[PDB]
Amino acid sequence: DNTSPISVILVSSGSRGNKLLFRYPFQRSQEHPASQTSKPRSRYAASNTGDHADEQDGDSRFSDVILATILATKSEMCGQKFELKIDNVRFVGHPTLLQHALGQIKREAPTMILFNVVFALRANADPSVINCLHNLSRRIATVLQHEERRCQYLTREAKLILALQDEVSAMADGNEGPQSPFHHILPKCKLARDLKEAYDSLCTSGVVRLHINSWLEVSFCIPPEAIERSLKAIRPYHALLLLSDEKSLLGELPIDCSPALVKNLQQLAQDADLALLQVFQLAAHLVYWGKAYMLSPNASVCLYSPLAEQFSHQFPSHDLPSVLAKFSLPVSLSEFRNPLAPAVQETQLIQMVVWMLQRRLLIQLHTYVCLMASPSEEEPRPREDDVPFTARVGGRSLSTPNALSFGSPTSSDDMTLAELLPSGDSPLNQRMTENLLASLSEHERAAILSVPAAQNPEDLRMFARLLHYFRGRHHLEEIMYNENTRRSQLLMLFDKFRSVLVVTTHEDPVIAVFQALLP
Amino acid sequence: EVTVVLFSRTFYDAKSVDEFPEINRASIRQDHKGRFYEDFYKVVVQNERREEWTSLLVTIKKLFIQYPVLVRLEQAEGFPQGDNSTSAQGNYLEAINLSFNVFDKHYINRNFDRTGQMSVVITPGVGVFEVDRLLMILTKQRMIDNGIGVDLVCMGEQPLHAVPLFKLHNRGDDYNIPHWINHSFYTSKSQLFCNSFTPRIKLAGTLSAPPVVPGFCCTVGVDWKSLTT
Amino acid sequence: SGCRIECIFFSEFHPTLGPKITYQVPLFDTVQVYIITKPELQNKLITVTAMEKKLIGCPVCIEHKKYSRNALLFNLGFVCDAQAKTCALEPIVKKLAGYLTTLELESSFVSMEESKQKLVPIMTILLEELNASGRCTLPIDESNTIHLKVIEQRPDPPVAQEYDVPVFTKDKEDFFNSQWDLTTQQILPYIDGFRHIQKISAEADVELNLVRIAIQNLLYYGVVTLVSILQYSNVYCPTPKVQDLVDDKSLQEACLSYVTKQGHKRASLRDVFQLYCSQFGLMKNLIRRLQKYPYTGCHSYDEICCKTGMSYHELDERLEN
């Protein structure tokens, strides 16, 4: 559904001085398909001096599409347009105009038209896709001082659209200190989903606009110690090298972006898992309770009155910062924020005291998958001796049809079967034991390349599918799949499932499983 | 050689000045339910061949606009309820039986210019009909003789069961499925995403051997070849 | 009142002494807009819908061409806001073009000019009554009463897998039980009986593909699916509660606010929120009833709705666990 009806540059609107189309066949400086040839200007066309058209999919009358496009893509007044024709064809149109003869805002002749570059889509578009096409057109259609219909960039663009689904990204991603989610979310979208622009603008702590392409490059013809301070544990050095590449160069990024890149191999496994499929976890608090020593005034102030009008005044008013002041004001600011990261921010000794005091008083606690660190963002919150880890999204292998000796059902502690100190909950080490041992050196990360499809099933089973298929209640399936790893007789007792896959009873395989149990 | 006959029912048209042998009265044995109703037939062109059609389409538009007063405010005026639902009542089986009442006397006045026999009922129904037992058994025994009946549904929306079906109306809800009838749907001409198969309306406020639901049914066409030749 | 139309226009390519006449009802079909949208209002391709964007708004239009000797060509256009939905206003304009076609082929409106003036109060009543309620019954003949309805055009529904659970967000007692399909009337009684594969052979005895299609259409209109309701946790019970245990996780799961495998921590770590925002269980016995089978009101929905009047706890609960 990410298809490609047409990307076209028709010479529909040549209104200028000399040395092109005007009343002859189609002809321009450095490009003349002429003398009455097939005349191609559209998407899938073999392109050199000579050229060949192809017509593949637009779900309409294609010569009518061309002859209506000629007169239905030109605009007289500038700007960018959009045309939704019938239910399943759209045109996100992008003209621009630069009409001047020898003004050049030296060449052989002014051959400058109303520009006519446009790509299409059918019937289920996305404003992100629309913004992508706007930005690509703005970067394509600039000046080209000597006019050059370089169609090699057209061929790279036509391969760019179908080839790579994602727009632009980076394998090297930065960090979430105290500032990066706010610096993301205050405009939320500066220019065209650019991770590199995002981390660089936060990296020098200032906004600078050097252009970013999608996959084909189009040119327009300081180090602070706080970075390595907030990025000690995860990626300081090549990120500082990317700072050097962005304070020095532009467009010369894929030379230094990617090629700069028990416990140790599990650290690399944590990196290769944080690249795609495992999230981390934190906790927060809140001051909300009540109904009809230093806890009862706070409770009264929260109950019969609003809070910040009262409890923010007494703690300087008695000339003592103490337990109730530390419980009142910084914990209230942390309740304004609600990660534990500002408690990491504004401290020098509070980190061993804060949850102690929250257990001391009647503040309500909860634990959660952390705030909005979505996979359209880089990587948050570096690993330490304390951060807990759990994977959710990424799929894995299969147990019951293929009848592996390795049991992998996704149940509670999701994948049922000095040593991972940052493992907070059981899914992390259960998933990596279901991946592989810690013995292979480079074949281990070859197997991490292999776990896409995970030795090639797709798991349509989530431990309640067995209760769907047959009379496997909770007790029986846990008693069998908690020693499934050892001997496959208990496996084959269910994995003779071909016999109740050829049921010939046309109503119910549950009764036939129950009958085929003991024999 | 065509007829185009419109037919419908109304409820509570009990009596007026000498409109008595026109009404009928429907009832149910197992739960008592008895109402007055009345059947209307309005014919358009009766027995006439002509080329260059589509003028009947203009006359059927005229009769569609004239129809609700034409059926409501006639012979008896109690409180009228017009044009009852097909999935609740209907004069369908009686209409096919009256077409058979025409076709039994084919030997009376014999045209030398016609061979085949055809009766097509266009309904906006869903496929459900609530039908008396005796009329259904009687029309089985009468289509034993000369099979001529074809049903097509311009409602569309092919439901999630064996679509020609009869709930019995005898003097579990007793189902029946016919295998003598030739049903065909008419999908309209447009292209969208997921054609829903359900309606919804918000109120203000020993054997049981045929059920109709375990029978599988993908799509039914129009079968133009059994409607043109 | 989501979509908001504002101007409706007819136009016609006049014989040569006039370019193109327009019949407007109130935006305004001004000079520069009609100049730059001139090329769409005459096309090779006819009888297709086409809408364009411009600085002020959006013409959704269709043109038609009839009476090929001194070839006549008209168009109906429907100009609305720049960024509204306007996906519910394509078939209405196309259907009006079809009605105008049959009106010209039966009685020839646009060859006599008093009917051309009569064509304008048609637009005024349409501009009132579309924004009034969204449907129009409008007689203009002894043989044509145009009928129009705004279809909401809801998005696609997801898949209905074989092991989920339906829940009515709405209430069954607000519809006509007599107005359903037969399959919906044979499913809808045991729809609170949670498991889908239970309810099919409990009451339905249908094809499982058929009950899948039926619950998918009820998901397309008014029924929300969720995952199964085996008692995962057991140890949430040592807090004191006032009879608020079963519907709790069903509601907050219907709010789509969890990672799925609830374990033993989800229920207590939000049950403190349920306790401050306000015989036996026979808990070993809901297990054999789970394969295929041949204060007065308990406060479970009232408290979440009366705090859904506020938004802090639904922030703290959309932020899931």
From Swiss-Prot, chain A:
InterPro entries reported in the protein's UniProt record: HTH_NPRL3, Npr3
Annotated stretches, region: Disordered: 25-58, 375-427
Tissue: Widely expressed. Expressed in the frontal lobe cortex as well as in the temporal, parietal, and occipital lobes.
Annotated GO MF terms: GTPase activator activity
Cell location: Lysosome membrane
Role played: As a component of the GATOR1 complex functions as an inhibitor of the amino acid-sensing branch of the mTORC1 pathway. In response to amino acid depletion, the GATOR1 complex has GTPase activating protein (GAP) activity and strongly increases GTP hydrolysis by RagA/RRAGA (or RagB/RRAGB) within heterodimeric Rag complexes, thereby turning them into their inactive GDP-bound form, releasing mTORC1 from lysosomal surface and inhibiting mTORC1 signaling.
Summary of subunit composition and partner proteins: Within the GATOR complex, component of the GATOR1 subcomplex, made of DEPDC5, NPRL2 and NPRL3. GATOR1 mediates the strong interaction of the GATOR complex with small GTPases Rag (RagA/RRAGA, RagB/RRAGB, RagC/RRAGC and/or RagD/RRAGD) heterodimers. GATOR1 interacts with GPR155/LYCHOS; interaction takes place in presence of cholesterol and prevents interaction between GATOR1 and KICSTOR.
Linked pathology: Inactivating mutations and truncating deletions in the genes encoding GATOR1 proteins are detected in glioblastoma and ovarian tumors and are associated with loss of heterozygosity events. Inactivation of GATOR1 proteins promotes constitutive localization of mTORC1 to the lysosomal membrane and blocks mTORC1 inactivation following amino acid withdrawal.
Protein name, UniProt field: GATOR1 complex protein NPRL3
Native source species: Homo sapiens
Gene (name only): NPRL3
Swiss-Prot record, chain B:
Effect of residue 123 to R: In DEE111; likely pathogenic
Source organism superkingdom: Eukaryota
Annotated tissue distribution: Expressed in developing and adult brain.
Subcellular location: Lysosome membrane; Cytoplasm, Cytosol; Cytoplasm, Perinuclear region
UniProt PTM comment: Ubiquitinated. Amino acid-induced 'Lys-48'-linked polyubiquitination of DEPDC5 by the BCR(KLHL22) ubiquitin ligase complex leads to DEPDC5 proteasomal degradation and inhibition of the GATOR1 complex. Ubiquitination may occur at multiple lysines.
Record's subunit section: Within the GATOR complex, component of the GATOR1 subcomplex, made of DEPDC5, NPRL2 and NPRL3. GATOR1 mediates the strong interaction of the GATOR complex with small GTPases Rag (RagA/RRAGA, RagB/RRAGB, RagC/RRAGC and/or RagD/RRAGD) heterodimers. Interacts with SAMTOR; interaction is direct and takes place in presence of methionine, leading to inhibit the activity of the GATOR1 complex.
Family affiliation: Belongs to the IML1 family.
Disease link: Epilepsy, familial focal, with variable foci 1: An autosomal dominant form of epilepsy characterized by focal seizures arising from different cortical regions in different family members. Many patients have an aura and show automatisms during the seizures, whereas others may have nocturnal seizures. There is often secondary generalization. Some patients show abnormal interictal EEG, and some patients may have intellectual disability or autism spectrum disorders.
Notes on the domains: The DEP domain mediates the interaction with KLHL22.
Protein name: GATOR1 complex protein DEPDC5
Organism: Homo sapiens (Human)
Gene designation: DEPDC5
Shown part of the complete sequence: 215 to 749 of 1603
Swiss-Prot record, chain C:
Record-annotated membrane-spanning stretches: none
Phenotypic consequence of residue 307 to R: Decreased ubiquitination by the GATOR2 complex
Keyword Signal among record annotations: no
One Gene Ontology term from the biological process aspect of the record: positive regulation of autophagy
Tissue spec. comment: Most abundant in skeletal muscle, followed by brain, liver and pancreas, with lower amounts in lung, kidney, placenta and heart. Expressed in the frontal lobe cortex as well as in the temporal, parietal, and occipital lobes. Expressed in most lung cancer cell lines tested.
A single GO molecular function term of this UniProt record: GTPase activator activity
Top-level taxonomic group: Eukaryota
Modified residues (Asymmetric dimethylarginine): 69
Pfam families given in the database record: NPR2
Spans annotated as Interaction with PDPK1: 1-124
Alphabetical UniProt keywords: Disease variant, Epilepsy, GTPase activation, Isopeptide bond, Lysosome, Membrane, Methylation, Tumor suppressor, Ubl conjugation
Positions of crosslink type Glycyl lysine isopeptide (Lys-Gly) (interchain with G-Cter in ubiquitin): 149, 307
Protein localization: Lysosome membrane
Mutagenesis or variant effect for residue 270 to A: Does not affect the GTPase activating protein activity of the GATOR1 complex
GO cellular component: GATOR1 complex; lysosomal membrane; vacuolar membrane
Modifications made to the protein after synthesis: In the presence of abundant amino acids, ubiquitinated at Lys-149 and Lys-307 via 'Lys-6'-linked ubiquitination by the WDR24 component of the GATOR2 complex, thereby inhibiting the GATOR1 complex and promoting mTORC1 activation. Asymmetric dimethylation at Arg-69 by PRMT1 inhibits the GTPase activator activity of the GATOR1 complex and consequently inducing timely mTORC1 activation under methionine-sufficient conditions.
Comment, domains: The arginine finger is critical for the GTPase-activating mechanism.
Family: Belongs to the NPR2 family.
Protein name: GATOR1 complex protein NPRL2
Organism, as annotated: Homo sapiens (Human)
Gene behind the chain: NPRL2
